Design an enzyme around this catalytic site. Structure first.
Site, PDB file in Angstrom:
ATOM      1  N   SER A   1      57.408-133.900 -22.953  1.00 24.88           N
ATOM      2  CA  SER A   1      57.257-135.292 -23.354  1.00 24.88           C
ATOM      3  C   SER A   1      58.248-136.136 -22.569  1.00 24.88           C
ATOM      4  CB  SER A   1      57.489-135.493 -24.851  1.00 24.88           C
ATOM      5  OG  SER A   1      58.844-135.261 -25.182  1.00 24.88           O
ATOM      6  N   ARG A   2      57.852-137.371 -22.251  1.00 30.90           N
ATOM      7  CA  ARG A   2      58.697-138.232 -21.431  1.00 30.90           C
ATOM      8  C   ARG A   2      59.845-138.837 -22.222  1.00 30.90           C
ATOM      9  NH1 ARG A   2      56.527-135.910 -18.123  1.00 30.90           N
ATOM     10  NH2 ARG A   2      55.190-136.619 -16.401  1.00 30.90           N
ATOM     11  N   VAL A   3      59.651-139.070 -23.517  1.00 33.16           N
ATOM     12  CA  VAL A   3      60.662-139.791 -24.281  1.00 33.16           C
ATOM     13  C   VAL A   3      61.847-138.892 -24.616  1.00 33.16           C
ATOM     14  CG1 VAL A   3      59.336-141.717 -25.166  1.00 33.16           C
ATOM     15  CG2 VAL A   3      59.028-139.486 -26.174  1.00 33.16           C
TER      16      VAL A   3
END
Ligand SMILES: Nc1ncnc2c1ncn2[C@@H]1O[C@H](COP(=O)(O)OP(=O)(O)OP(=O)(O)O)[C@@H](O)[C@H]1O
Ligand SMILES: Nc1ncnc2c1ncn2[C@@H]1O[C@H](COP(=O)(O)OP(=O)(O)O)[C@@H](O)[C@H]1O
Ligand SMILES: [Mg+2]
Ligand SMILES: [Mg+2]
Lengths: 177, 277, 141, 365, 210, 70, 105, 52, 70, 52
Positions: free
Chosen positions: F6-8
């Site tokens: 995930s990017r976050v």
């Protein structure tokens, strides 16, 4: 009393009862030895087969006529058909005889059996012949041994073994004819 | 897609190179450690000539040692003597007696502490790292005569040849417990021997049985080391055969995928050009 | 391990029957369980777009969302396999336009484009029959 | 609702819905005709409605064999008692042009849909090789002047297959239990015509070539066949936990398939050799003899109830049958027949020394 | 339409009904594979058209086993009921014994160990393999094949060495009197009146060597 | 778990879960780089044995049922 | 290759001899015919070869035969692309080969 | 595969290349220590087969 | 060295090099045949150790820095 | 891996025959005698079968 005949061939039937028939019967060390103690023979004259063994090397399996062993009651010669004996060897020189030729190994202890079929077996742990031992470090080793004597039982048993072996080795290096 | 099969080919190819190297490594180790096995066979002869060979004795306590291996690419040795251990142990425990199972080599402590776990008191390892010596086997035998059983069963693979390894059980009767009783034949068979020792026969038999345990334990682990090398030499040949067979099938699979890849990419290019031309 | 954000695009990818619809459905059920607990502005309105699925699966999902109560916050856009190729092509855009109402009116939306690889297939058919030139696996450029 | 078929791997690992669509995915010689004939033998006799067999692009000899077997077994009657026949055959076999094989599934659907809609019946519909519909559409599609899609099929594969398969539906006024054989073209499950079919079915039974080459019949891949009925809230938690445990043991064996090949079983851990032994037991135990395969195999077929399957696989999972050999599980009905075959396998090795058979002074009798 | 190309051709091989003359046509299509890949396109097309298969393995053809019939893969499920009885009496046991011969196939002692209780299945499957080898352009009548597999299966050739079973078969066919061939060909089955006379004529044959 | 990204990462999850799941993300990575040596079982210094004996617990912890969110 | 085969065919049919014909790298004959077929706008077959592959090889290889007047024996060097014997050009060449002489380093 | 080890930034230490890696440009200390790091990493990548 | 060919070969090289590189390519081929043994600890039968040291020094003799031809 | 020492004489007559067989497959060619000195040999078919 001999009411329980144990042995390898008696082990096979009980193994065929209690262990399954998937596996073949295990071997035993008496299946690799062609020579026994009570099975008569092997003398056929004036010679008799010797078996000089260390754990790391087989020194002789030839046929000698005279074997000189350093027993704990003293040296003794084994001729062709000796009495069956179990002789504990002290540090000393084992001397093999083929006639005019001789092999003189200095051993460190061990045992020596003479069997009722005339064979003999010399079972030592370290048998160095006399050119492989130096006469310079045996006196240094006895001087380092017989001087520092701990009164503890284990160290004094080791010291008694030390002075016995090094005294026999000092008396054996100059007693070559 | 088409790169995973090529990296799997590159995996199995140097796996086959690894196992072909390991076969010759184990073969050189079998060739070098054969002469010591031939030399140590001599000293186990006079003790079974003198004390005989009585495996099926009725005892009160028995230390059974199974001489296994240290590293485990041997391929069916350390489990075969575990099978032989339980097969020779169920044969000789129907007297209500105690049994101590020992293993020399740490591939036996992984295979013996789940089949006979509560009777497993001692585990010995690292005996083949430098070499096998008689002082090492004598110390191992000293921890075996820490307890005083009436028998000592030694389970090991006898190096018969580079092809055949017969598993061999060897027994040592402790002197006053079983050896002076298992030799009586209208009197005794040991009374034909003239004891030439310092103290009595009850002590020279004690020294002889401890020395016999040490001798056959040294020979047992030396024979088992040579059987380990000669079984690894065959297991790595089987691994080269299997990783050549798998590589040969995977090469054909890669060739089919390569042919299908050029065909489907070319069909895509023709279908693109036929919509415009 | 893979924590979602409230405006984040998160791809559920796998083989057939590996639990992708299960993850999206449990997300919708959890928004139903959280919407009855938060004050009116963190409430999440789900939109499920069923592209290319059969109608029995969509009816089973409507039965699930009604028997758990998740249909009060959920819209379902259903272009099934029997529908035309432009309907399945256009159904993710219809679901995104229905879900953009909550995004543009200050609320928070959740959109699930189930079987986006079937919307791509419907688009491939629609563009190949318009005689546009095909590309990789005969997809449009 | 569950539909029990008497097949162990089908009833255990991917159970069939009573009014659902069923796929039998196969690779030309793996047994999706023998499996669909066994489903006809087991399900359609216990069923109370009408069966509609649609033969799409299969062998004409198979259609004649099914006609003679259905006349002989009495589900097709000739002459005046024809109204008591319970099966309609619709045959568009592989000797027909691709226009006939493209629409004969629609004829079978029409005959089934009249029984479902108007008659209100519960219908069975067996369609042998629903792939041939797609293949016939791809054959006619090259001459309709279309640009081809992926690997060579028509651009309208998914919508034609959807417009066909969405007509087969358990509605509110009638049910159709559809069992469709699907053919994978070159043992490629990633081929677009079976990969499109996978999304239309409630229970796939993927038959594998390698499982058949092991001698296991039916050659169902246990780690590739799925069903929507394998859910603990619909078939109970015991059956579901047994199926998931069997799949876990088979997946742990499939993870060890490369170490066992390139190194042998002697280098496995002691916990993994038990996994391999239990998995080689449960993958012989998934196999089963069929009543329709008894003509060329000789062994009689076995119908296995559901509780016998769960009770057998409980016993093989927990470790109750580590005594019995692996071949005692092979081609037997239930867990009783495993023990009654391990008896016959150990009477027979004791029957090496029973007698010397000789019949003397016999030639003038 | 490359599937349609072969299905058009092979569906015309049929067995006609009694109101169409009762004639028949038997097809033997031949498909060549590349490196034994039978999962190819045209291979799997004709496999899903024809009734059975005769898989000829390339490994057995270079090991001298000719005809190199892959007995594990090649089936025939339509002529299984159309088998000569007598050959159906012995060949089912033959195929079962060759099935349990492939449980020790190429790991007799090659992999890890040998049992020496299943030495019998190896030294009998080798006899059943060397029984089925047959030279080219010399087809055998079926009544002389069922007698040869009777001698190979009932146990009349186990003391013959594996190097001379091909000579033992022709010695059995030459030395057994030709009346049993006519009786087995006319009756169409090994009758209980015939197997006694066959075991009589099979114990007075001079199997060479041994 | 080695491929799901995930990017976050942080600043988009529960602050309570952020303190706890870092020791999960690390120890599953410790479990995955050990479990590719699960053919021998030498159990090196009771450390490679311990990290799989915790990572198996973490993977068995992460399982849950269907249609029952927490 | 047709030119060289015609020079051999005059020695076969008119002289009545047993002529040899050496084709160095028959794979290059296949590749040149594939390039000619690709330049003529024809749709390629499997892996990139011409659709006329079996018949373009057979138009050459069937004229190499023994007749009642003489014989042409052909020794063709064969290259195998990417060491794939199942590639269409060696698999189509091997259907005509009556022998095989492997020379190894 | 470098990021699967947890190493960030996941630069391939071998497959990364620059024109500045030249002893005539960055100096024979920097160039030799970079070549030594790449040598020991390639040696470990060759040993990663026999380790498993 | 194993995949580099020269079809003109030894007929177009230095005759001083022709008598000395002929042993070199055979020693390097022998080193390539035994190159799996190089990363082993238990030392081999000393015929393969001789080629494994000889070829490993010969591959170091073929190294060359850039833009300095000899 | 073992040597000529552990080869049986039953598996050493095969070596002593196969070595001279693989020698006897070699043959000098007439077209090479302009630079190899030894003349070329034409071997008949019957001489080949007899000599092998
Ligand atoms: N957390 C879970 N626990 C138990 N079973 C599950 C779980 N998640 C999914 N399943 C099972 O896996 C099967 C496939 O589920 P799902 O439909 O979500 O996968 P899918 O990839 O959407 O399938 P398809 O590719 O056919 O659409 C279902 O039958 C479901 O019961
Ligand atoms: N259950 C089974 N028992 C025994 N043999 C089987 C079984 N299923 C398939 N086979 C064998 O596999 C072959 C499968 O043929 P078929 O049923 O026509 O499958 P397909 O239609 O996929 O070709 C048959 O020839 C048969 O011998
Ligand atoms: Mg889904
Ligand atoms: Mg079929």
């Amino acid at each position: 009393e001999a009411a329980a005949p144990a042995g390898p061939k008696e082990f096979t039937e009980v193994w065929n009862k209690k262990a399954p028939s998937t596996l073949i019967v295990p071997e035993f060390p008496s299946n690799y030895t062609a020579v026994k103690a009570v099975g008569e023979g092997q003398v056929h004259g004036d010679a008799f087969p010797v078996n000089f063994y260390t754990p790391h090397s087989i020194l002789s399996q030839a046929q000698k006529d005279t074997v000189v062993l350093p027993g704990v009651d003293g040296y003794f010669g084994v001729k062709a058909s000796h009495v069956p004996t179990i002789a504990q060897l002290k540090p000393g020189v084992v001397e093999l005889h083929s006639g005019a030729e001789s092999e003189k190994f200095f051993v460190s202890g061990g045992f020596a059996f003479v069997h009722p079929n005339g064979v003999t077996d010399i079972c030592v742990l370290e048998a160095a012949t006399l050119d492989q031992v130096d006469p310079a470090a045996v006196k240094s080793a006895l001087a380092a041994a017989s001087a520092a004597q701990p009164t503890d039982e284990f160290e004094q048993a080791a010291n008694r073994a030390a002075i016995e072996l090094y005294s026999a080795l000092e008396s054996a290096v100059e007693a070559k004819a | 897609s088409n790169q995973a099969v090529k990296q799997r080919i590159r995996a199995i190819k140097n796996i086959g190179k690894i196992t072909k190297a390991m076969k010759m490594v184990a073969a050189s180790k079998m060739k070098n450690a054969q002469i010591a096995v031939e030399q140590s066979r001599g000293l186990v002869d006079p003790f079974v000539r003198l004390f005989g060979d009585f495996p099926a004795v009725n005892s009160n306590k028995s230390v059974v040692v199974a001489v296994t291996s240290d590293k485990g690419l041997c391929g069916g040795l350390n489990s075969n003597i575990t099978k032989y251990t339980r097969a020779t142990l169920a044969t000789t425990e129907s007297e209500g007696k105690d049994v101590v199972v020992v293993s020399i080599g740490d591939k036996g402590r992984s295979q013996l502490t789940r089949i006979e776990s509560q009777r497993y008191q001692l585990a010995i390892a690292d005996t083949y790292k430098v070499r096998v010596t008689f002082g090492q086997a004598s110390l191992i035998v000293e921890e075996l005569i820490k307890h005083n059983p009436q028998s000592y069963q030694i389970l090991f693979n006898k190096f018969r040849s580079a092809i055949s390894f017969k598993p061999t059980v060897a027994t040592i009767l402790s002197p006053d417990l079983l050896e002076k009783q298992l030799e009586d034949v209208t009197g005794n068979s040991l009374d034909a021997y003239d004891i030439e020792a310092s103290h009595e026969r009850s002590d020279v038999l004690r020294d002889l049985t401890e020395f016999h345990l040490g001798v056959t334990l040294y020979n047992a682990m030396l024979e088992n080391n040579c059987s380990e090398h000669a079984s690894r030499m065959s297991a790595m040949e089987n691994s080269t055969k299997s990783a050549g067979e798998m590589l040969g099938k995977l090469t054909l699979d890669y060739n089919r995928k390569r042919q299908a890849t050029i065909t489907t990419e070319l069909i895509e290019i023709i279908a693109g050009a036929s919509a415009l031309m | 391990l893979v924590p979602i954000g409230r405006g984040q695009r998160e791809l559920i990818i796998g083989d057939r029957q590996t639990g992708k619809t299960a993850v999206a459905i449990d997300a919708i059920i959890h928004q139903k369980n959280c919407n009855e607990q938060v004050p009116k502005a963190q409430r999440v309105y789900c939109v499920y777009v069923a592209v290319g699925q059969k109608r029995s699966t969509v009816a089973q999902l409507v039965k699930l969302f009604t028997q758990t109560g998740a249909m009060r916050y959920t819209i379902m856009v259903s272009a099934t396999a029997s529908d035309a190729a432009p309907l399945q092509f256009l159904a993710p855009y219809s679901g995104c336009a229905m879900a953009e109402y909550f995004r543009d009116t200050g609320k928070h939306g959740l959109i699930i484009y189930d079987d986006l690889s079937k919307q791509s297939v419907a688009y491939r058919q629609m563009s190949l029959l318009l005689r546009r030139p095909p590309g990789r696996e005969a997809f449009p450029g | 609702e569950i539909l029990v078929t008497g097949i162990k791997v089908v009833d255990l690992l991917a159970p069939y819905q009573r009014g659902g669509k069923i796929g039998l995915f196969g690779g030309a010689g793996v047994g999706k005709t023998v499996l669909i004939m066994e489903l006809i033998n087991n399900v359609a006799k216990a069923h109370g409605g009408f069966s509609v067999f649609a033969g799409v692009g299969e062998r004409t000899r198979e259609g004649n064999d099914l006609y003679r077997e259905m006349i002989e077994s009495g589900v097709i009657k000739l002459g005046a008692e024809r109204g008591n026949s319970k099966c309609t055959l619709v045959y568009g076999q592989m000797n027909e042009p691709p226009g006939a094989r493209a629409r004969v599934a629609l004829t079978g659907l029409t005959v089934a849909e009249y029984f479902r809609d108007i008659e209100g019946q519960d219908v069975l519909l067996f369609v042998d090789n629903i792939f041939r519909f797609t293949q016939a559409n791809s054959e006619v599609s090259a001459l309709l002047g279309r640009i081809p899609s992926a690997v060579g099929y028509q651009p309208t594969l998914a919508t034609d297959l959807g417009g066909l398969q969405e007509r087969i539906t358990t509605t509110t006024k009638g049910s159709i239990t559809s069992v469709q054989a699907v053919y994978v073209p070159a043992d490629d499950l990633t081929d677009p015509a079976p990969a499109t079919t996978f999304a239309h079915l409630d229970a796939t039974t993927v038959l594998s070539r390698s499982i058949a080459e092991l001698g296991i019949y039916p050659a169902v891949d246990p780690l590739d066949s799925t069903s929507r009925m394998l859910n603990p809230n619909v078939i109970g938690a015991e059956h579901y936990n047994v199926a998931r445990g069997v799949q876990k043991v088979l997946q742990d064996y499939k993870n060890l398939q490369d170490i066992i090949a390139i190194l042998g079983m002697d280098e496995l851990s002691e916990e993994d050799k038990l996994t391999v032994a239990r998995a080689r037991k449960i993958q012989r135990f998934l196999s089963q003899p069929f009543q329709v395969a008894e003509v060329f195999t000789g062994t009689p077929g076995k119908y296995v109830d559901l509780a016998d399957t769960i009770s057998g696989f409980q016993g093989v999972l927990t470790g109750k049958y580590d005594d019995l050999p692996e071949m005692a599980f092979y081609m037997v009905g239930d867990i009783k027949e495993v023990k009654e075959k391990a008896d016959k396998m150990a009477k027979d090795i004791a029957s090496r020394k029973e007698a010397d058979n000789k019949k003397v002074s016999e030639e003038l009798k | 339409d490359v599937f349609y190309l072969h299905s058009r051709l092979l569906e015309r091989a049929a067995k006609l009904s009694k109101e169409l003359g009762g004639g028949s046509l038997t097809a033997f299509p031949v498909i060549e594979t590349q490196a034994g890949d039978v999962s190819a396109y045209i291979a799997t097309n004709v496999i899903s058209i024809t009734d059975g298969q005769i898989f000829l393995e390339t490994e057995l053809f270079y090991k001298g086993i000719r005809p190199a019939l892959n007995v594990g893969l090649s089936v025939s499920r339509v002529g299984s009921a159309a088998q000569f009885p007598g050959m159906k009496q012995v060949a089912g046991t033959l195929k079962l014994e060759l099935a349990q011969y492939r449980e020790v196939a190429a790991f007799a002692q090659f992999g890890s160990d040998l049992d020496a209780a299943t030495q019998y299945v190896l030294e009998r499957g080798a006899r059943l393999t060397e029984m089925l080898k047959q030279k080219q352009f010399a087809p055998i009548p079926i009544e002389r094949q069922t007698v040869a597999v009777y001698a190979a299966t009932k146990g009349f050739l186990d003391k013959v060495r594996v190097q001379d079973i091909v000579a033992a078969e022709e010695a059995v066919i030459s030395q057994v009197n030709p009346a049993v061939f006519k009786i087995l060909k006319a009756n169409g089955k090994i009758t209980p009146a015939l197997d006694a006379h066959l075991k009589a004529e099979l114990r007075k044959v001079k199997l060479p060597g041994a």
